[PDB]
């Protein structure tokens, strides 16, 4: 019924938007992967899964800021692989647990081919992870917007 980031900018129960300040790998290369492990940064939990039986999925993912420019990657949900930006529904991964579990998303952003110069400006938007919350208890199809902001600057080095 809720989702919270590591920085403390938590989304209220009804949904809403908050910032995800993500500490990145300051240099990644083409072929190598910028593994922005949001599984270690944004997490989600349910109020009581005994009757709610929540179903929490990544209904939307968008590339804004630095990632939109060069870094084109793939969203990994529970080990699977989907085209990021997430233009399709992702299969439900429940979080039938009161205790918080680390929201298994991981954007594998391998940058575009050789890109150019400096990429992913510090303090700039990385992505927008719009999460869907559903359950069999009611029709509370609730909206959780994470605006992923880069905490630091990656480079796509020349060579």
């Amino acid at each position: 019924f809720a989702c919270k980031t590591a920085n403390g900018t938590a989304i209220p129960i009804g949904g809403g938007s908050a910032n995800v300040y993500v500490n990145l790998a300051p240099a990644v290369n083409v072929g190598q992967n910028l593994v922005v492990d949001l599984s270690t940064q944004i997490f989600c939990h349910n109020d009581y899964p005994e009757t709610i039986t929540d179903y929490v999925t990544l209904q939307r993912g968008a590339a804004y800021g630095g990632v939109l420019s060069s870094f084109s990657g793939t969203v990994k949900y529970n080990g699977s692989s989907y085209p990021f930006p997430t233009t399709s529904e992702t299969p439900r991964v429940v979080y039938n647990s009161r205790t918080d579990k680390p929201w298994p998303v991981a954007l594998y952003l391998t940058p575009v081919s050789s890109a150019g110069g400096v990429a992913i400006k510090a303090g700039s938007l990385i992505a927008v992870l719009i999460l869907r919350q559903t359950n069999n208890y009611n029709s509370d199809d609730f909206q959780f917007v994470w605006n992923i902001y880069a905490n630091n600057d990656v480079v796509v080095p020349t060579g």
Partner: antibody
Amino acid sequence: EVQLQQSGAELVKPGASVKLSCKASGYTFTSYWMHWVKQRPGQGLEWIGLIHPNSSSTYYNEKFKTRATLTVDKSSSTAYMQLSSLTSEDSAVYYCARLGYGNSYWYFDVWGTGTTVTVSS
Amino acid sequence: QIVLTQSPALMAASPGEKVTITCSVSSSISSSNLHWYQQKSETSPKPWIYGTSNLASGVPIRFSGSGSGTSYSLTISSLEAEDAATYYCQQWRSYPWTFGGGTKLEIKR
């Protein structure tokens, strides 16, 4: 612990590029990021740049663009530096390093031996 | 370029004294973006703090950075004599990656 070695304090005339070398074949170059920095006497450090051992891709500083050329030789795991137009403004100790993976951050986890570049005439 | 001004060059402490080596940044950078490196005199440097709060390998528990924004510190609970070295502040917010001018932490005897 596996470390990085470096050349001894070498002599270079003004206008001569050094061949400063940091090498270590015991920690598998195709795993880390192989950075370079510079420390002047009195004046503080100045980040020189980076090259990837896996693919020989470099990113330097604006103050060090067309100043230092950090190369990699991962087969022998050697890294040299080209310093054409080496003036006394570049007379400094020059250090090798690499980014580790400490938590979500990357940082100069292991340093080289260190080598003093003297550009006195 | 990112200006990074510290306590300019001078420091001094006894075996146990606190050293509040400040690191003022021209922009309010996040705690993720700051590093500290220890370089002993005529000796190779060592990573001392990465990410403003997480110490590197071999750095004792006495060192611990803090702060955010444009003010940055390296609070030391008990500085021993062996730690006498120049501590260079580094940013990795932007990519001049401008190191500091370095505070030569000497020893006050």
